[PDB]
Design a protein around this ligand. Structure first.
Ligand SMILES: *[C@@H]1O[C@H](CO)[C@@H](O[C@@H]2O[C@H](CO)[C@@H](O)[C@H](O)[C@H]2NC(C)=O)[C@H](O)[C@H]1NC(C)=O
Ligand SMILES: *[C@@H]1O[C@H](CO)[C@@H](O)[C@H](O)[C@H]1NC(C)=O
Lengths: 48, 48, 48
């Protein structure tokens, strides 16, 4: 759904879907080649 | 940096005798905001 | 007719393997994509 989110001080607006990108144990959120926020990790359940 | 003590470490298996040729990134382990002044160190060797 | 058939039969080779030609369309696509990417990347700048 189209909502607004705030993850550990990272904010934005978009839709959130289940992904398959595997983050490293320490990486928090993923960015793109054009350097824009693309994928974030849920701080509670460590879900991507 | 900025009063923080950052730890980056990696335990690479050895193929050979000493300093094998290869690449391996060092993932951070723990960040600690101490904020003190460091100029010298000395490694500790176990004595049995 | 035989000379023309032989000449037309080598078109599919010299068009790609020899490079040279066929670079203008690739240059157009690359330039437009690069301009778009540079425009998007500017959003992360601080500008002071
Ligand atoms: C934040 O606290 C929550 C409290 O629920 C933790 O969620 C639990 O996590 C454990 C370990 O993965 C699971 O077995 C439980 O089922 C979770 N509980 C619920 C209600 O979902 C969460 O792991 C904590 N986060 C961190 C980073 O420690
Ligand atoms: C320690 O570093 C801090 C950082 O500004 C500074 O205030 C202080 O004077 C430094 N002390 C020494 C002995 O270098």
């Amino acid at each position: 759904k189209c909502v607004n989110f705030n993850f550990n001080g990272l904010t934005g607006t978009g839709v959130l879907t289940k992904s398959n990108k595997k983050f490293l144990p320490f990486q928090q959120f993923g960015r793109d080649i054009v350097d824009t926020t693309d994928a974030v990790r849920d701080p509670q359940t460590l879900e991507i | 940096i900025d009063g923080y003590f950052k730890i980056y470490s990696k335990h690479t298996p050895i193929i050979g005798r000493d300093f094998p040729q290869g690449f391996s990134a060092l993932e951070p382990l723990v960040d600690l905001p101490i904020g003190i002044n460091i100029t010298r160190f000395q490694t500790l060797l176990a004595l049995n | 007719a035989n000379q023309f058939n032989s000449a037309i039969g080598k078109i599919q080779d010299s068009l790609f393997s020899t490079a040279s030609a066929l670079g203008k369309l690739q240059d157009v696509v690359n330039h437009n994509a690069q301009a778009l990417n540079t425009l998007v990347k500017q959003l992360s700048s601080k500008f002071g």
